[PDB]
């Protein structure tokens, strides 16, 4: 498959007044790993991140064109973008290529810049949006991530517990996938700060 060509995993998780997004760090070509510091999570404003898994080229390209349109948005209007709006923007961007799609399944995680209400979503390769109140996943180890997230996720979690949960989910899901891993990175974001961590992970 095309999506499995580079592999990779991206997850987002809701908390109390916080939100989390994580991704593995491997960039490989089929069986061969090329790099272990590949960026799959991109800041799209303060307290609003997007996660892209799938074909590495389209990860980078979608990220870049997204930053393009986003910057134009934040210039024309005098405000940072709302999460729903970013989701609709990405959806539009992906559906423009309905018959020649980018091979990425984006995940959005952020807090409403006006309020603080956490928001998460995921999209098709052709931009079908899906919002949940618990978690979203995308990647070559989707079934694994589903398995972990359905068993670990509690509703009203505090930053520390959200962290531990999303970290354990990502680690244990990725460790049952050959083309995902070589490290994990987690952004846990709340109203006042953003914590970025790299997990101690297997490198095989």
């Amino acid at each position: 498959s095309i999506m499995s060509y580079n592999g990779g995993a991206v997850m987002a998780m809701k908390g109390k007044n916080c939100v989390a997004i994580a991704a593995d760090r491997r960039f490989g070509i089929q069986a061969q790993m090329v790099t272990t510091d590949f960026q799959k999570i991109f800041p799209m404003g303060d307290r609003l991140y997007i996660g892209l898994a799938g074909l590495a080229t389209d990860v980078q390209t979608v990220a870049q064109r997204l930053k393009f349109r986003l910057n134009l948005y934040e210039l024309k209007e005098g405000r940072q973008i709302k999460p729903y709006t970013l989701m609709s923007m990405v959806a539009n961007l992906l559906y423009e290529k309905r018959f020649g799609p980018y091979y990425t399944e984006p995940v959005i995680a952020g807090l409403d810049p006006k309020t603080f209400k956490p928001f998460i979503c995921s999209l098709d390769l052709i931009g079908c949006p899906m919002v949940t109140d618990d978690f979203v996943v995308s990647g070559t180890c989707a079934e694994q991530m589903y398995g972990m997230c359905e068993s670990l996720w509690e509703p009203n979690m505090d930053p520390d517990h959200l962290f531990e949960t999303i970290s354990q989910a990502m680690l244990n899901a990725v460790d049952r996938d050959a083309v995902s891993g070589m490290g994990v990175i987690v952004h846990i974001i709340e109203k006042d700060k953003i914590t970025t961590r790299t997990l101690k992970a297997r490198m095989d």
Binding site: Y5, N6, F27, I29, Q32, V34, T35, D37, F38, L55, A56, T57, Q60, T61, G100
Partner: protein, 199 residues
């Protein structure tokens, strides 16, 4: 089949490539150069399809030179790498895609030495060391085994020699000679060719 390799040190980038131009079962050229000067401090190592390599590489080259002539200053290795990556990515879903794998070595006055890896799908990845081709499968591990971020250029050349010797030992393809260049603060310097006097 073609081999590229790059090793980044603290203040230099070492690059090497095979010198064989092959077709069918014969070597047609034994002094072929895979490298392309794009600035005073940037090298582009291009490999792959027959016409696509030179066409793409030279297009990029003349555009970088154009930037230099239009603005007075040169592109940074990063800006260059992202430029070639943008060009390669835009042609991907077009009628005329380019089957090229490439390395971009460079030295910036600010950010220092840089080594970029590019797949033919146009995925850009910065790395301390990289390689392209079948030979990579036999060489990367060696690098993994012996590379340290503070490696001297002398030790870098020695390591390179280890990889190429391994190629001489296990690889079924010939590859008797290797172009070797190095980039630093003073620009691109040509090193003596690593060769193995077969016949």
């Amino acid at each position: 089949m073609e081999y590229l390799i790059g090793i980044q040190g603290p203040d230099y980038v070492l690059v090497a490539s095979d010198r064989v131009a092959a077709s069918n079962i014969v070597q047609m050229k034994d002094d072929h150069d895979k490298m392309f000067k794009m600035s005073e401090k940037i090298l582009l190592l291009c490999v792959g399809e027959a016409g696509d390599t030179v066409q793409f590489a030279e297009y990029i080259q003349k555009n970088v030179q154009l930037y230099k002539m239009r603005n007075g200053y040169e592109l940074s290795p990063t800006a260059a790498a992202n430029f070639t990556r943008r060009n390669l990515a835009d042609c991907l879903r077009s009628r005329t895609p380019y089957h090229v794998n490439l390395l971009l070595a460079g030295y910036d006055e600010h950010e220092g030495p840089a080594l970029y890896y590019m797949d033919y799908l146009a995925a850009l990845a910065k790395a301390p060391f990289a390689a392209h081709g079948y030979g990579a499968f036999l060489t990367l591990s060696i690098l993994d085994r012996y590379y340290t971020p503070t490696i001297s250029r002398e030790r870098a050349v020695e390591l390179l020699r280890k990889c190429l010797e391994e190629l001489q030992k296990r690889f079924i393809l010939n590859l008797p000679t290797f172009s070797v260049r190095i980039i630093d603060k003073n620009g691109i310097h040509d090193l003596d060719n690593i060769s193995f006097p077969k016949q």
